[PDB]
Each structure stands twice: as C-alpha cells, then as structure tokens.
C-alpha cells in the first residue's frame, strides 16, 4: 500500500495473508470460517500446491503475538474464463482445510447480495484497501498491515482521466488517485476493497492490477466482486473435490 497508514491491530480482522513455503504471496479476505476470496493471478506460478498457507489475525510480520491463526489451503477455485498471465476474471475462492476460530482479531467480511452491491454499494464513494505490500513502487514490503481509503470511479471517467495497456472490462472497476501519491501495490494483490454501509462492511473489490504502483495519471484496478456473487455462493454450497486447484465454469 502506497501513502496509507498502519491499520490499528484488529481493525482489518478479515484481512488474510497468503504464504507459499513461508514466503509472502498475496492477500485475501475471509468471508466466513472456511472461505477466503483472493485474486486468481496470485496462483499463476504455484507448483508447491501443498505448501499454501492462509494466516488470519495477522498484524506485524516480525512477531508472533498469539492472535495469528494458520490454515492449510485445501482448494483454490478459479473461474474457467480466467486466463493465466492476464487481468480479466481475477478472482479465486479458497477453501481452508479446517475452519478458523472467530475472535476479536479474526472476523469475516460480509459477501453482499448482487442487487444490494450493484444498486447501493457501487455508489459509496470511498472504500478501504489493505495489505502488507510495497510501501513504494520498486520499494520494500510493509512489516505491519497497511490500509488506504480510495474513491471509486465510473469506468468512463477512469478511461477519460487516465494517460499495450489492458482494457477495463465489466468484471473490473477503477479506484484511487491519479496524482501518484496513493495506491495499492504488487504484494497487496488479492486483498480486500471493503465498503462501509449503515454500520457494516462489505466485500466490493479485490486488489487486482495497475501500471506500476501510484503511477501519475493511473488508478488501481479492482475485480468487481458483484459479478461473481452467484458463482461464489454456488461453490460454497458444493462438496470439496480431490486436487487443490479447481477450475469452475463461469457464469
């Protein structure tokens, strides 16, 4: 996260940290005790599928304080329409091997209904993005969880206000600033874009892509979660299948 602040410990309790062989991979969002939403591009280079770990209740990476909960990732579900190395349909649904225990430090974010998300949440201006990503473009990653408030743009405005570049599809939305001061970054990928509405927080986006980090004339691009609500809900109501990676038809 570029130009944000430290998220006070326990204030982003749905934030997930994803690890591969103990190394920082991506972020994610806890949506109930066994399911995590992340970005499909996080898994393009995984070979060690058995060494994928999700950490909940994480805050400071240099110290174990006892609030952290680690779980092996039993399944990674990607839409059939996602193509590795590309940006469209950038979403993954992760099943944890065992549920996490809900505590003051581990709480899921509400996965909203599609209609509520499209006709109400999509109009809330500002939302929070968070992660342990780079504090700067070509800079070191954060030791403490960072959070940033970003405003959402209509796609027409994003394309007009912006300077080989990928297109902005109906499965994405733009959010942030074009002055090069504030943005999400590389290592924040998969993390939540969370929207507050009448005392409750909801999942509206997933940190997906951008041209560098906080590049002048460019905004962050987020997966438009509202397009995937039914796809996510049907998968969560289904029985697990052998093998970690699963490609599931979309729509």
């Amino acid at each position: 996260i570029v130009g944000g602040k430290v998220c006070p410990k326990g204030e982003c309790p749905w934030q997930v940290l994803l690890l591969v062989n103990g190394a920082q991979l991506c972020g994610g969002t806890l949506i109930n005790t066994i399911w995590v939403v992340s970005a499909a591009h996080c898994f393009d280079k995984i070979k060690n599928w058995r060494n994928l770990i999700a950490v909940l209740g994480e805050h400071d990476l240099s110290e174990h304080d006892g609030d952290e909960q680690s779980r092996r990732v039993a399944q990674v579900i990607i839409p059939s329409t996602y193509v590795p190395g590309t940006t469209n349909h950038d979403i993954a649904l992760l099943r944890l091997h065992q549920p996490v225990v809900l505590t003051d430090h581990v709480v899921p974010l509400c996965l909203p209904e599609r209609t509520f998300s499209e006709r109400t949440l999509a109009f809330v201006r500002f939302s929070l993005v968070s992660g342990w990503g780079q504090l700067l473009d070509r800079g070191a990653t954060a030791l403490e969880l960072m959070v940033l408030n970003v405003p959402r743009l209509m796609t027409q405005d994003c394309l007009q206000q912006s300077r080989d570049s990928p297109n902005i599809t109906e499965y994405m939305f733009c959010a942030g600033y074009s002055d090069g001061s504030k943005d999400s970054c590389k290592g924040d990928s998969g993390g939540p874009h969370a929207t507050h509405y009448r005392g409750t927080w909801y999942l509206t986006g997933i940190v997906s892509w951008g041209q560098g980090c906080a590049t002048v004339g460019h905004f962050g691009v987020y997966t438009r979660v509202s397009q995937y609500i039914e796809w996510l809900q049907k998968l969560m109501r289904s029985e697990p299948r052998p093998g970690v990676l699963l490609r599931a038809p979309f729509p």
Binding site: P8, G10, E11, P13, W14, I31, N32, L102, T103, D104, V107, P108, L109, C110, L111, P112, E113, T115, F116, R119, T120, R198, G199, T200, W201, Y202
Partner: protein, 55 residues
C-alpha cells in the same frame, strides 16, 4: 422500492408484486420489528469490528 435508497433497508431488499417490499439480513443477523434494521444474533457477525464495537 429497492432501487431508491435501498428501499429503506439497512442490508438487503427484495421487491414484491405491488408496492410491497421485504428487507432481509446477512446470516448472523435478524431483522427488527421496524422491518428495516438488522441486529447481530452472534458474537462475531460479519463486517463488524469487535475492538471498535466494544468501545
């Protein structure tokens, strides 16, 4: 009714045949007798921050 200011619902809104509207809540919440407000039914409802709630 649901398209305009979320039909007055705190959370989810369903339109029905006529001028009829039903508000609904996410799991771990119950709808109050006002028919619009959602109250937590569990210790850790989704999208609420316990350290801020217990302050």
């Amino acid at each position: 009714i649901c398209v305009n200011e979320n039909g007055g619902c705190e959370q989810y809104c369903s339109d029905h045949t006529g001028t009829k509207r039903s508000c609904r809540c996410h799991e771990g919440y119950s709808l109050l007798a006002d028919g619009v407000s959602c109250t937590p039914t569990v210790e850790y409802p989704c999208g609420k921050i316990p350290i801020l709630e217990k302050r």
